[PDB]
Amino acid sequence: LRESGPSLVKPSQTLSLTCTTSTVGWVRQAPGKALEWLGSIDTSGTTGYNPGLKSRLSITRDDSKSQVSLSLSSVTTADLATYYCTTVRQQVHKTCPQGWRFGWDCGFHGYGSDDCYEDCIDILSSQTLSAEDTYELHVDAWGQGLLVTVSSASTKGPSVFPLAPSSKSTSGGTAALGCLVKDYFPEPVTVSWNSGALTSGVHTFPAVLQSSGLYSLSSVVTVPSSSLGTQTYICNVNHKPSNTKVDKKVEPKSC
Amino acid sequence: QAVLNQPSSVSGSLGQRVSITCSGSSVGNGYVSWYQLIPGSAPRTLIYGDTSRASGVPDRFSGSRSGNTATLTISSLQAEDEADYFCASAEDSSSNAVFGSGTTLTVLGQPKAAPSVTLFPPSSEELQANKATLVCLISDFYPGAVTVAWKADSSPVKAGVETTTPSKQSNNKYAASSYLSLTPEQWKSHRSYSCQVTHEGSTVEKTVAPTECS
């Protein structure tokens, strides 16, 4: 389940996303809000939509390319959210009242066998009530989640600056070094270290939003102090909205 | 528009048991599933069909029902369980489901930890780009409650400051960040800048001076 599509869509426009794979649904979450169902579509092509959104929602599927599509028209800032591609299991369950029995459980397989019967066998032509339905739906698997920002502002790639350790900022055997990712738009920025080989002691912080309308964050790693003079540390900044990837080597200060 | 209401916040002690309730809008016609959302990760399905566990879900996660009220119980609370939990249910043959209001679970009794504070002055590269950002990084503290103040020559500074809310690191301890955005001229117009981090009756202050190399 791979969410693909723009991270930025302008107001009034129709957001359009795709989920490559190889019963699919869509869920989203706006900041500080609960999960919000959107819709799904099974192998038979039938579709279901959140009643409050089915006006603007449109979901398709290409069993050929194994690609499900979501189309949300006339988007507003209210549609700013993380959009999750999911897999759904749906199974309606039928039960009879206490005592009452299914026709097929009494031994009858003619017409009406799937209904409930108060009088079993005993002249089965008896009182017949439809079985009670209990619906079971849950998401099996979740996608990673694509962040969609809705705004008129223009994309801007980040400027990366080094957060270098110095002789007085060490902590004995350990030392902190990082990268400052400044003035980008929209979110998100992903940061790795040494192309994913360096994962321990790494922490990437949530971004701040400046009065300029632009974002900034920092990523830091605690490394051994002894290795600093010769070890190579590179932060890998990726900003898919601008298709910008920046690798910056962080050297320790000469003081 | 079925209303599944959860307590916005619930707290339990490490190793003990806790319950997150999911009550209906008022004939519970659908089964309840539960989901775990840890920031930076995609949601994780815990329980489905009121009481059945999903794949890879430990045994301490258990679900139960009592007529329009579903309960998620975590029998042996762990620190990695601090997260947001959402119930959900489909109320009809519609291929649609509704999610609960959500619960943020707090795990108390974790080991307290004083914050480490790292203060980076503006890089020579950023200063040569005609900008100056002081970066105060706060790491490895519990509980996740800090206030951050900036000082210029011991005089408080409130403008050009941005701070992030504490969030969990990979080791279940918290971290926060704060920035002071200045002009290169302002950076040199003082003899020192401080980042002051208060945490549980303790204040850690780190200082940088434009006249001394970090």
Author numbering:
A (entry chain H): 4 to 25, 33 to 82, 82A, 82B, 82C, 83 to 262
B (entry chain L): 1 to 9, 11 to 95, 95A, 95B, 96 to 106, 106A, 107 to 212
Text lifted from the article:
Ultimately, we isolated a total of 8 and 11 cross-clade nAbs from cow-485 and cow-488, respectively, all of which had ultralong CDRH3s, suggesting only ultralong antibodies were responsible for cross-clade neutralization detected in sera.
The ElsE Fabs all have CDRH3s with 54 amino acids and 4 cysteines, with a 1–3, 2–4 connectivity, Bess7 has a 61-amino acid CDRH3 with 8 cysteines (1–6, 2–5, 3–7, 4–8 connectivity), while the 55-amino acid CDRH3 knob region for Bess 4 (6 Cys, 1–3, 2–5, 4–6 connectivity) has no ordered electron density in the crystal structure. Ultralong bovine CDRH3 knob regions fold with 3 short β-strands connected by 2 loops (Loop1, Loop2) of varying lengths that can adopt a multitude of different secondary structures, including loops, helices and β-turns. The ElsE series of Fabs all have highly similar knob structures as expected from their high sequence similarity. The ability of the knobs to twist and rotate with respect to the body of the Fab likely enhances the ability of bovine Fabs to access recessed epitopes. There is no convincing electron density to indicate tyrosine sulfation modifications in any of the antibody CDRH3 regions; however, BLI experiments indicate that Bess7, with 3 tyrosines in CDRH3, contains one or more sulfated tyrosines. Low sulfate occupancy or flexibility in the CDRH3 knob region may explain the lack of electron density for these groups.
